[PDB]
C-alpha cells in the first residue's frame with residue numbers, strides 16, 4: 223500500500239520548500255495531502271506564490287495518521303505552524319506512534335514550539351539556528367540533511383531536493399529514491 | 410527601475426520549474442508576473458500542485474514588454490505553450506526587441522514550435538533533446554544552463570536554481586545573483 227504524506231501549508235511558507243517535497247514525493251508514488259493550516263482557501267507563500275491546498279488541515283487530520291508529517295519552512299510559515307494547537311496535536315500523535323517527522327529551514331522551530339523530539343540532532347537554516355537552539359533542547363548539525371530518532375531536518379531552498387529524497391528513502395527505500403533522482407537532473 | 414519578468418503558466422507545467430524561478434527572481438527584486446495561459450483561474454501543474462496566477466496572460470501581455478519571458482517546462486505544459494498563438498506573439502515580440510527569453514526542461518520545445526532563436530545553442534531536459542533537435546535548427550548543449558544570443562536554457566528541476574540565478578545575473582548583474590544565492594543554502 224502506498225505511503226502517505228501530510229504537508230502542512232501555512233501563510234508565509236517558503237513555496238520552494240513546499241513544492242519541491244510535494245512534487246518529488248509524488249514522483250515516488252507517495253500519496254501527498256497538501257493541507258491548509260487556515261482552511262481550504264489558497265495560501266499566500268513567502269514570495270507571493272499562491273498555492274491552493276488539497277484540503278483543510280481540519281479535514282486532513284481526520285484522515286490520519288500519515289507515514290510522514292512535513293513542515294516546510296519560511297520564517298512566517300513556521301511561526302504560524304508554531305502557534306497552531308492543531309499542528310501540536312498532529313505532531314504529538316506522530317511522535318507517539320514513532321512516525322517520521324520532517325522539517326526544513328525554519329520549519330524545525332515548530333518542533334521546538336511543540337516540544338517534539340527533544341534530545342535529537344537537528345539542522346535548520348543557518349539564520350534559524352539560534353531560535354532552534356534556545357534552551358539547548360536539541361543538538362545542532364550543519365549537515366545539509368540530518369536524521370536522528372524520528373526527526374528528519376534540512377536547511378533551506380537549496381537543500382530541498384536532498385530533504386525530499388531523504389523522505390523518499392525513509393518511506394520507499396533507497397532504490398526508489400535513486401530512480402526518482404535521475405530524471406531531476408540534479409548535480 | 411526594477412526589471413520585470415513574465416512567467417507563462419500552463420496546465421501541466423513542472424511546478425518546481427515554475428516556483429523556483431519565480432521565488433528566486435523575487436528575491437532579486439525583479440517584479441514577476443505569473444500569467445495564466447488559459448485565463449485567471451488556478452492552474453493544475455504536472456504533479457498536481459495548484460498555483461493561482463497573478464493575472465491572465467491576456468491581461469499580462471498588455472502590460473509588456475518584459476525584461477525576460479520565462480517558459481517553465483513539464484511536457485504537457487510545454488505542449489500547451491507550443492500550441493498558443495498568444496505565446497507565439499509574445500515570444501516574437503521579445504525576440505524582435507532583443508529581450509531575454511528563458512526556457513527550462515521541455516520549455517525550449519516551445520521555442521522550436523514558434524520558430525524562435527534558430528541557430529542558437531540550447532540545452533533541454535535529456536528526454537526532450539530529440540524533440541528540440543527535430544530539423545537541426547538549434548545546436549545542442551549538455552551544459553546545465555546554456556546561453557546563446559537571446560536564448561537562456563536549462564535542463565530540469567535539479568537545474569532550476571542555476572537557471573533562475575542565470576536570469577538574475579543577466580538582468581541585475583553578478584553581484585546581485587551572488588547575494589541572492591547565499592541564503593538559499595545551495596551546494
Ligand SMILES: [Cl-]
Pocket residue numbers: 236268295296297298
Ligand atoms: Cl523566509
Ligand SMILES: [Cl-]
Pocket residue numbers: 423455482483484485
Ligand atoms: Cl514532465
